[PDB]
Design a protein around this ligand. Sequence first.
Ligand SMILES: COc1ccc(C(=O)NO)cc1NC(=O)Cc1ccccc1
Ligand SMILES: [K+]
Ligand SMILES: [K+]
Ligand SMILES: [Zn+2]
Length: 401
Amino acid sequence: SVGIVYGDQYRQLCCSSPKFGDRYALVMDLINAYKLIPELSRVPPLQWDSPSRMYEAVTAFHSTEYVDALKKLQMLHCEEKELTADDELLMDSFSLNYDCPGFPSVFDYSLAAVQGSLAAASALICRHCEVVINWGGGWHHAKRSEASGFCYLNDIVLAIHRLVSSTQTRVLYVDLDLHHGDGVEEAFWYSPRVVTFSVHHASPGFFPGTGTWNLPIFLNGAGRGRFSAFNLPLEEGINDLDWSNAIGPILDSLNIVIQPSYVVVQCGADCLATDPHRIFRLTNFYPSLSGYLYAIKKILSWKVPTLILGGGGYNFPDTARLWTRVTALTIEEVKGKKMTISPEIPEHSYFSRYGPDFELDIDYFPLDSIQKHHRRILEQLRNYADLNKLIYDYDQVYQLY
Ligand SMILES: COc1ccc(C(=O)NO)cc1NC(=O)Cc1ccccc1
Ligand SMILES: [K+]
Ligand SMILES: [K+]
Ligand SMILES: [Zn+2]
């Protein structure tokens, strides 16, 4: 089946942060309004037998002292008085500040995404589902002992760790967010079994700053993980077609060479033309074909067990519009059953948020650099396969580009 993570408590926690507000409710309620929920298997978030088991899972990646600090931050924000100077210094030491502030539910909110994405990986491993979706997950910036970019716990890293250890097992991670997937890339920098690939904007001063030239050179992993971290940085303004042609051949070549056992996809919606970032010009159109739907369709055509996660996306109704179409397309590709979605938003709880026109399309009217990157990336893929003693014909792959 196609699985999707939701639940009453899960919904409440995912809607409890100051930055993402009620976005998750819009997404799941638009999916429901389009009558997709009967087609999907509900995957319940993971819960644990004890505090010690919870810590054992989360500290598979994060440090005990960082988890302690994040939980203390929640407790301090549930009291009336301000932080002490010593507690401020403590939170500063883990970057629990500025763009990663405290709020009354910060630990439960962050933990919930881990619970959902771990539960999703388990549903793939036991073969209950062929694909699982978690629109509450996808927080790719968090590090072992550091919050970053409103990411406090890295649910992606923990989900991937569960997949690679279920065994040889290899995972391909594809990061479609506007931003570089630095936290996931870093966690697996020395690991050849998890190949990471992020496409993103990069430019001087733009967050988080990595995933680009370091004549400077491209770092790409280390140790036995050399050549296992891939990046495609793109200039602002790119449309659906140029973005699709940029990543399409890379995706096909990665699958041919790596032969992954699982694929994990981060589908942050901040590349939409209507995102307040206003950097890329992608759409959710489905006849121009949305770069997002082009990529998901290609990935799903591989017939490899796949985890689809959320991420960025700061125009909440347009993020719901996109993720509803990704959800419908996943059902259609996996089940071979046609999903017909009306071009008009159906009546439901949040109908008023899709004014003034109430349509499913977003409200938008629409290379020598990329050829150079393709040559660079093809040579890196060759070096990866040589180092890891992997089989493949340079011809079938070269001709993809
Ligand atoms: C440090 O800033 C960020 C770090 C990570 C991400 C992200 O999406 N990562 O994948 C995004 C931002 N930036 C913003 O949220 C900017 C913004 C957008 C809408 C309304 C107000 C401000
Ligand atoms: K990305
Ligand atoms: K790696
Ligand atoms: Zn982002």
